[model samples]
Target: SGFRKMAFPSGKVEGCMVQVTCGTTTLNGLWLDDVVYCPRHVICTSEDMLNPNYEDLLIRKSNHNFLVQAGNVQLRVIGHSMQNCVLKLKVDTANPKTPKYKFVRIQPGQTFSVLACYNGSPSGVYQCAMRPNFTIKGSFLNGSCGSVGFNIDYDCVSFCYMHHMELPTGVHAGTDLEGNFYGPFVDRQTAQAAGTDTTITVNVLAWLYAAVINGDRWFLNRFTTTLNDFNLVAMKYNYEPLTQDHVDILGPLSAQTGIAVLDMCASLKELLQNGMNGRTILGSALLEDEFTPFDVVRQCS
Candidate 1:
């Protein structure tokens, strides 16, 4: 609902970024003079951003955010103050606007996504708030935080973003990360091996996923929303409704286990594979040990 622009600090790039934050939904653009980076979700195209006019007619409208390279728009908490402290994401609704914010708690060593964009290019900005806390005065370092609100032993929530992609056509769960909805990135080895005018190649591996359900692999990336709630993907930013069959299966599995459905991928993947194990929720620690796993309880739903 509002726009804020700031120039990059010295030694940084030579442009400025313009951010329009309406409630919790904040989208920005990179303005290195002309618009260098604008999000795909915005009505304007990269072409529109990159291609513009001069100050003659007062150069109207083409307005831009900075870049966080890690492309890792996940949140993690380090040192904290006070006792029984906690961090939670302010889940944005039609208003990620606080009045309607439905917060979700973050598990220890567990990460959360922006529930919106990738690499911060196609990005989604998420707001984190600490509780049993207050924003006390703090700094601009890695340990930067203000002890003021949630109200002691407290710091304000930090924001983060990440990119999430829609499931591509002619693509299956098995395809590797190379092919996005955009033009394909050829699997060099296979393409070279096939070597034909009409032939193209992609490196696809078997993706052990639920046959009854289909969408992005929740387990493959960050679990921003209900994590393991088995949400339906729609336009990527939104979600679709579950079919009766999906409801039936996810419902039962969910009721029993308390963790987000995506988090349950460890068990579900293995179970689906007749038992598979690409990775797990806590860490890269392989589940190959044969057995284990959530204080919150995990479900297929």
Candidate 2:
């Protein structure tokens, strides 16, 4: 719902705030001191209050391919929250003769289990915006309207921090990096106090990938372009440690896009043993399988 009146202090909750005003606005611009409710974020009052950034959580850039090192790849998009945050994508054109097809109504936090149909070029630049609330923040992204094939699937919430937590720290919960603990806590104080975190969970997706790339198991959340402050922090800078299986998943996902059943099965076993289970077995196995010293090779071979 949209509010037009001043909200009383009794309704206000600590660690969040809201200011009142009007005209065209974006989520990022809607700060804590500017709203009547808690304004839907924690950093709205933090020192970085004025310039909240959101590019850190972006996992894909149009030019980059998806892989382990995927040329600066990160899993920072929160699917569930993306559905809730609406966006309007604007496309600029060079050809005046071409009829510019302005695509609208991109629910950032919305999930489409099956791909939607498209009319024009699959590849293009888009300026997106959200509505009903009319939060004016718009950002660009590379999108493919049509895929070769579509599958029926359940949509997962990408921005769980927004919908579930009502507050955001903009950190990926999956990474074990230095600042990774910034996740789950509402604010720095809550982050420091024990037993104050609100943990979120994801039903294991593709165990093979998880097992092998267990280090990168952090859950990423996509937020409103206007509210991208947290998105940027969680995605761009801090990420998890990579393992062989992490690179391995990238090798296949990038190479074939599809693989044989046997390869998948074998990889799954290695994933759990080396990744999910831990490296102890893998380390021992690697040594016992065939130990060949450089000195021995030089003398014998």
Model 2 accuracy (lDDT, Cα): 0.21
List TM-scores for all candidates, in order.
0.19, 0.18
| RMSD of model 1 against the true structure | 21.2
Candidate 2 residue lDDT tens string, 152-259: 113211111111111222211110111121133332223322222210101011222222232332221221222133223323322222334433434443233233
Best by TM-score: 1
The numbered model that scores best in lDDT is 1
**Residue 264 in candidate 1 has what lDDT?**
46
Compared with the true structure, what per-residue lDDT tens digits does model 1 show for residues 194-227? 1111100000001112211223243443333333
What is each predicted model's overall lDDT from 0 to 1? 0.22, 0.21
Off by over 4 Å in 1: 1-110, 113-156, 162-301
